[PDB]
């Protein structure tokens, strides 16, 4: 799915208010622009990786799916390293234009 037509500001607000908190509490690469970043979050959150495959059902993953479904037309150890990369991608997504 191409994230070119998404509403990036509402997704960013949802992350900064809600998704980021769950993403940090779960702890207990880069991207060029906003669509590429969102592609990276989608792939790195909902597509299973080597070993850390159960990340798609986490609560922050539910939040990401909810935000993407609402604001993207037509959308609807190793784990710590993956979530750190996800935090980096989200942080670069929130970068001002």
């Amino acid at each position, epitope marked *: 799915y191409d994230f070119t037509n998404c509403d990036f500001e509402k997704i960013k607000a949802a992350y900064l208010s809600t998704i980021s908190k769950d993403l940090i509490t779960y702890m207990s690469v880069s991207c060029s622009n906003r669509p590429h970043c969102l592609t990276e979050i989608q792939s790195l959150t909902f597509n299973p990786t080597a070993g850390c495959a159960s990340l798609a059902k986490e609560m922050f993953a539910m939040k990401t799916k909810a935000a993407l479904a609402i604001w993207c037309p037509g959308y609807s150890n190793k784990c710590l390293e993956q979530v750190s990369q996800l935090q980096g991608l989200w942080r*670069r997504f929130n970068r001002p234009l």
Partner: antibody
Amino acid sequence: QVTLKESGPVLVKPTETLTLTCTVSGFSLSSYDISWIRQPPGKALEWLGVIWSEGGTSYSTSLKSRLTISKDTSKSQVVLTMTNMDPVDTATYYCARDSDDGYLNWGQGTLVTVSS
Amino acid sequence: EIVMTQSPATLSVSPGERATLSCSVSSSISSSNLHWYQQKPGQAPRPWIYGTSNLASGIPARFSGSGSGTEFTLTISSVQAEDFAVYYCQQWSSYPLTFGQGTKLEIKR
């Protein structure tokens, strides 16, 4: 904890070159992007410019031709170089790590006096 | 750039009263994109309010924020002696970052 410390206060002759070094601790330069903001004495904060985590850089439109922000992640240093100084450039310069929540997360600030 | 203005330039409020500081943005920005900083003379600015509504670490409950689109406000319910300082609103929407001219909340007598 996140700390940003610029170099000491400096005196720069007019039409010389300012070089400020900001050493940061508590985070990596490859994950956070560092902005430089100057405040003239008694005036509002002026955003000089940012260097990004992946290596890109953006500068203020008025001061684009003079600014140069370089980064060394090995030494954890951000270097601001400003050329052709004017006595109107004396100010307090801050290096600020644009945080996860977006707040600048300012440094200590160094006084620069541009006078002959 | 996004040219964003603060009102009033100077706010005369006696201690214990209610203070309201307005920030008006030339273009509509997201609520999470506005931050408030407090600066005292001879000191660096301090991150003070996050995303128009979220207090930072250590800032007491007296301070609150509320706004959307163009208009945002920082409100102190009971101004104390330590709350007299220069408050800056800053946009995080797009480059270049722009700050308000600053509102000097100062003691009225």
